[PDB]
Design an enzyme around this catalytic site. Structure first.
Site, short mmCIF file in Angstrom:
data_model
loop_
_atom_site.label_atom_id
_atom_site.label_comp_id
_atom_site.label_asym_id
_atom_site.label_seq_id
_atom_site.Cartn_x
_atom_site.Cartn_y
_atom_site.Cartn_z
N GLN A 20 -9.70 9.45 -58.48
CA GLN A 20 -9.43 8.05 -58.13
C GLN A 20 -8.68 7.86 -56.82
O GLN A 20 -8.72 6.78 -56.22
CB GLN A 20 -8.66 7.36 -59.27
CG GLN A 20 -7.25 7.86 -59.51
CD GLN A 20 -6.60 7.22 -60.73
OE1 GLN A 20 -7.07 7.39 -61.86
NE2 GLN A 20 -5.52 6.48 -60.51
N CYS A 26 -7.80 4.00 -62.86
CA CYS A 26 -7.86 4.79 -64.09
C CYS A 26 -8.62 4.07 -65.20
O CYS A 26 -9.40 4.68 -65.93
CB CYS A 26 -6.44 5.12 -64.58
SG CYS A 26 -5.40 3.68 -65.01
N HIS A 165 -1.35 4.49 -68.39
CA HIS A 165 -2.45 5.21 -67.74
C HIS A 165 -3.69 5.31 -68.62
O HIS A 165 -3.62 5.80 -69.75
CB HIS A 165 -1.94 6.60 -67.35
CG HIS A 165 -2.92 7.41 -66.56
ND1 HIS A 165 -3.49 6.96 -65.40
CD2 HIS A 165 -3.39 8.66 -66.76
CE1 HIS A 165 -4.29 7.90 -64.91
NE2 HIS A 165 -4.24 8.94 -65.72
N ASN A 185 -9.08 13.27 -67.46
CA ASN A 185 -8.32 12.40 -66.57
C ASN A 185 -9.21 12.08 -65.36
O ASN A 185 -10.35 12.56 -65.29
CB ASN A 185 -7.03 13.11 -66.13
CG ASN A 185 -6.02 12.18 -65.48
OD1 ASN A 185 -6.18 10.96 -65.47
ND2 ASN A 185 -4.95 12.77 -64.96
C1 LIG Z 1 -4.33 3.18 -63.64
N1 LIG Z 1 -4.66 3.87 -62.61
C2 LIG Z 1 -3.09 2.37 -63.71
N2 LIG Z 1 -3.00 1.67 -65.01
C3 LIG Z 1 -3.71 0.65 -65.56
O1 LIG Z 1 -4.63 0.11 -64.95
C4 LIG Z 1 -3.34 0.19 -66.92
C5 LIG Z 1 -4.13 0.99 -68.01
C6 LIG Z 1 -3.84 0.68 -69.52
C7 LIG Z 1 -2.31 0.87 -69.85
C8 LIG Z 1 -4.36 -0.73 -69.98
C9 LIG Z 1 -4.66 -0.64 -71.48
C10 LIG Z 1 -4.92 0.85 -71.78
C11 LIG Z 1 -4.70 1.60 -70.44
N3 LIG Z 1 -3.60 -1.23 -67.03
C12 LIG Z 1 -2.77 -2.25 -67.32
C13 LIG Z 1 -3.28 -3.58 -67.03
N4 LIG Z 1 -1.56 -2.03 -67.83
S1 LIG Z 1 -0.29 -3.06 -68.25
O2 LIG Z 1 1.06 -2.49 -67.68
O3 LIG Z 1 -0.53 -4.57 -67.81
C14 LIG Z 1 -0.41 -2.81 -70.00
C15 LIG Z 1 -1.14 -3.73 -70.84
C16 LIG Z 1 -1.20 -3.53 -72.26
C17 LIG Z 1 -0.52 -2.41 -72.85
C18 LIG Z 1 0.21 -1.50 -72.02
C19 LIG Z 1 0.27 -1.70 -70.61
C20 LIG Z 1 -1.85 3.36 -63.64
C21 LIG Z 1 -0.44 2.69 -63.69
S2 LIG Z 1 -0.29 1.45 -62.39
O4 LIG Z 1 -0.19 2.17 -60.98
O5 LIG Z 1 1.00 0.54 -62.64
C22 LIG Z 1 -1.76 0.43 -62.45
C23 LIG Z 1 -3.02 1.34 -62.50
#
Ligand SMILES: *[C@H](N)C1(NC(=O)[C@H](CC2(C)CCCC2)N/C(C)=N/S(=O)(=O)c2ccccc2)CCS(=O)(=O)CC1
Length: 218
Positions: A20, A26, A165, A185
């Site tokens: 990625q 992810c 993640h 991953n």
């Molecule tokens: C991925 N590269 C990244 N994470 C996400 O995109 C993250 C993935 C989850 C946690 C969503 C549901 C299963 C996998 N997406 C979101 C939207 N997370 S959140 O913080 O809004 C969330 C929602 C529900 C439950 C838990 C968390 C890695 C981490 S990042 O750099 O902050 C964003 C991209």
């Protein structure tokens, strides 16, 4: 009764590990990975699907933010609503946000629905991996140990059920008794065990691996 161990790579349902890069996609990679397996089971063809397609098109209307994060579930719904997703070959990954360039002439797969498993139930997750196929999940990867992981069964005392993640469970088993989930991953083939990480299984929903699991169907 379920098998003691499962590895979907042995069944030809898992594509090459992707990278990625600096784009937080992810969620998109997790979603395409799950659908890739269903596509193989339905058509007999193993084809990498376009994660970029999701990053560029499954956006605001789906609560997603491209390289800044998103959900596998809403990504699946986009594929359903859109009546298709392009092949990775026709819509390659650029690790950046782009204008949606989806074209039905490059369609490689469809989705009819998706299922979200009950919260924190590792037994239900095991049954889904054994009988349905790879399952998209979220894990808590906010610890240095995750980035430094090299081999064996991963266990982090500081892990929580607050996931961040998105990855793909492609199997399960045990390493000398230590049970684990086989996770694909999207950090390239140099991460962990050549792109994969085996995470503790049946250890109280470790790192929240069974917190939000889901899988699509064709
Ligand atoms: C991925 N590269 C990244 N994470 C996400 O995109 C993250 C993935 C989850 C946690 C969503 C549901 C299963 C996998 N997406 C979101 C939207 N997370 S959140 O913080 O809004 C969330 C929602 C529900 C439950 C838990 C968390 C890695 C981490 S990042 O750099 O902050 C964003 C991209």
């Amino acid at each position: 009764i379920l098998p003691d161990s499962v590895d979907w790579r042995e069944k030809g349902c898992v594509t090459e590990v992707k990278y990625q890069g600096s784009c937080g996609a992810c969620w998109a990679f997790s979603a395409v990975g799950a659908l890739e397996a269903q596509l193989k089971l339905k058509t007999g063809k193993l084809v990498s699907l376009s994660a970029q397609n999701l990053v560029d098109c499954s956006t605001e209307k789906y609560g997603n933010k491209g390289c800044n994060g998103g959900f596998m579930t809403t990504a699946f719904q986009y594929i359903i609503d859109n009546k298709g997703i392009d092949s990775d070959a026709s819509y390659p990954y650029k690790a950046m946000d782009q204008k949606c360039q989806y074209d039905s002439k490059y369609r490689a797969a469809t989705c009819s629905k998706y299922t979200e498993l009950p919260y924190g139930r590792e037994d239900v997750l095991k049954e889904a991996v054994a009988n349905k196929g790879p399952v998209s999940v979220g894990v808590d990867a906010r610890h240095p140990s995750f980035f430094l992981y090299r081999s064996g069964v991963y266990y982090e005392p500081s892990c929580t059920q607050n996931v961040n993640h998105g990855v793909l469970v492609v199997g399960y088993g045990d390493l000398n008794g230590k049970e684990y989930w086989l996770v694909k991953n999207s950090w390239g083939h140099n991460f962990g065990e050549e792109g994969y990480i085996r995470m503790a299984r049946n250890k109280g929903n470790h790192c929240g691996i069974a917190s939000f699991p889901s899988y699509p169907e064709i």
